[PDB]
């Protein structure tokens, strides 16, 4: 479970997908009858892995 920077050649050899993780921020506000709101911050939740085009900006 430890993240390591995957090189494209290692992705070619090990049959991996050369993809980068996509993290998004969600703010959860709870509205309850007769009650206020609470804004909770889930910063950088993983929502998937975007395949990276080689030699683009977010390639290694």
């Amino acid at each position: 479970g430890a993240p390591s920077p995957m090189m494209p050649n290692e992705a070619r050899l090990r049959n991996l997908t050369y993809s980068a993780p996509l993290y998004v921020d969600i703010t959860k506000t709870v509205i309850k009858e007769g009650e206020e709101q609470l804004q909770t911050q889930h910063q950088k939740t993983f929502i998937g892995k975007i395949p990276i085009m080689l030699r683009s900006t977010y390639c290694l």
Binding site: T17, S19, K28, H42, T45, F46, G48, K49, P51
Partner: protein, 60 residues
């Protein structure tokens, strides 16, 4: 982006389905556990690997 619009729409659909199932029970949901991160991941991976530009169930 045409792929990612549909897959992010499906991500929000499954988040609303999960949270609806966990508010009809009168409980709280874990939002970091609500996100089905494999919707974007294997959807992009499938469409780039096969070349069919859509979902797995609409290959024709």
């Amino acid at each position: 982006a045409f792929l990612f619009r549909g897959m992010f729409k499906n991500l929000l659909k499954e988040v609303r389905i999960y949270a609806q199932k966990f508010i009809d029970r009168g409980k709280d949901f874990n939002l970091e556990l609500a996100i089905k991160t494999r919707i974007i991941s294997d959807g992009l991976k499938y469409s780039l690997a096969t070349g069919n530009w859509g979902d797995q169930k609409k290959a024709h």
